Amino acid sequence: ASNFMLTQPRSVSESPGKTVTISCTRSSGSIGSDYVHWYQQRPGSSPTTVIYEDNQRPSGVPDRFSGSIDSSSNSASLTISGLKTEDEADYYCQSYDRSNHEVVFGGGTKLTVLENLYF
Amino acid sequence: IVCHTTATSPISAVTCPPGENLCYRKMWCDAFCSSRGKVVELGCAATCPSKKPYEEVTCCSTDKCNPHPKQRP
Amino acid sequence: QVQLVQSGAEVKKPGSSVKVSCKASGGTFSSYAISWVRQAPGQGLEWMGGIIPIFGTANYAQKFQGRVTITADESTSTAYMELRSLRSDDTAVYYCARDNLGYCSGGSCYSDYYYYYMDVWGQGTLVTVSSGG
C-alpha cells in the first residue's frame, strides 16, 4: 500500500566551478520503469523543472544541468557542472508509482556553494 | 444512435449524424504508450472505420457503447 | 507562457476547511491535468492529487482521500483544492501545478492516468492552522 521511496541526500556542498551530482534512489521497483524528473526550488519561490524524462532539458535551462539513470544502483542523478552561486537551491526528484497511481517526490537536497577553498 | 466522442471538451456523448448508425473506438500507441496507454479515438460512423497496421478498431451499435476507459465501468 | 495564479494566504482554526483557488491564464485548461502539491514548513514536496477537466475525473493521494476535494471549472479557468478538518500537519504552502503532457489532441485522448512532469507552477498559498483538535 505504501508508495516506493525516492531517497536523496539531504545536503550537498561544493565550490564554484566544480561538478556536483545529486542522486535519487528508488526503494522498490526499477528506476527505469518510470520517468524521473528534477526540480529546482529557490527560497521563497515555486519549483521549476531542470530535467524531465530522465535526461531532457527544458528550454532556458543551462547545459550545465544534466540527468542520468543508473540501473545497477537503481538511481537517477542530476549533475551540475561548472557550479555557480545561483545554483544554491533545493532540488527534488520526482517519479510515479503505477501500483498506487501516485506521484512520488524525493525528499529534497539542499545544495550549498562553499565560499572558501578547502582541500 | 448516441455515441461517445473524444472530439469535444470535455469528452462527451453525441447523437450521431444521419446515416452514421455505429459507434467506434480506434486505438494506437504513440511514444508514451508505456505510461499513458494507447491513444483512443471515439466517435460515430456509417461503416466501421478501416484500420491501418498496428491500429485496433471496434464498433458497436447500442447507445453509449464505446466509452473511454476512464468513463467505462 | 500560461501562468497559474493562486489565492492568498489564510490562517485557520483546527477543524475548519480551506478552499484555495488556481486561475489559469488563457481562458482554458485544454486537455491538461492540474495537480495540487504541498510543502509543510522546512519539509519536502508532497502530491495531494490532481484533476483532468477534459475527462471530468480527479485522482487523489491515499493520504488525503476523502478529506481533500480537487475541482476545476473550465468555464472560469479556475481549479480548486478544498481541504477539510484542518490540523497542525496541514500548515503548509499549497501549490497548483500543470502536467506538461496533455491528455488529448486531434480528437483523440490517452487511455490511462500518468502524472508526468509539472511545467507551470502557481506561486503557492500559505495555509496556517492553529493548534489543538
Interchain CB contact of A37 with C (< 8 Å): yes
Question: How many domains are contained in chain A?
Answer: 1
Helix (H, G, I), strand (E, B) or coil at A107: coil
Which residues are paired to C60 by β-bridges? Answer: C49
Q: How was this structure determined?
A: X-ray
Give the chains touching A; criterion: ≥3 Cβ pairs < 8 Å: B, C
**Contacts for B66 with CB less than 8 Å, ≥ 6 apart:** B3, B4, B23, B24, B25, B42, B59, B60
In angstroms, the separation between the Cα of residue C2 and the nearest Cα of chain A is 14
On chain A, the residues whose CB falls within 8 A of the CB of C119 are 49, 58
**Residue A117 included in any domain:** no
Determine contact, residues C68/C78, Cβ cutoff 8 Å. Answer: no
The second-level CATH assignment, the architecture, of B2-71 is: Ribbon (2.10)
Resolution value, angstrom units: 1.3
* Residue with grid cell 517526490, as numbered in its chain: A105
Q: How many CB pairs under 8 A join A and C?
A: 59
Residue boundaries of the structural domains of chain B? 2-71
Contact, A46 vs C4, CB < 8 A? no
| Contact yes or no for C128/C10 (Cβ under 8 A) | yes
Report the C-alpha gap between A103 and C50 in whole angstroms.
10
Between chain A and chain B, how many beta carbons pairs sit less than 8 Å apart? 3
Shortest Cα distance from C74 to chain A (angstroms)?
Answer: 24
| Residue A53 within a domain | yes
Chain B residue numbers with beta carbons less than 8 Å from the beta carbon of C101 are 32, 36
C116/B35 CB distance under 8 A:
yes
Residues B45, B26: contact at Cβ < 8 Å?
no
**Domain CATH for A67:** 2.60.40.10
Cβ-in-10-Å burial (0-12, 13-18, 19+) of A51 comes to buried
- From chain C, pick out residues whose CB is under 8 angstroms from the CB of A41: 45
Query: Domains of chain C, with CATH numbers?
Result: 4-100 (2.60.40.10)
Determine, yes or no, domain membership for A12. Answer: yes
Cα–Cα dist A117/A109, whole Å: 22
Residue A115 maps to a domain: no
What order do you get walking across the sheet with A65-70 strand by strand? Answer: A6-7, A20-26, A75-80, A65-70
Q: Which domain holds residue A70?
A: 6-107
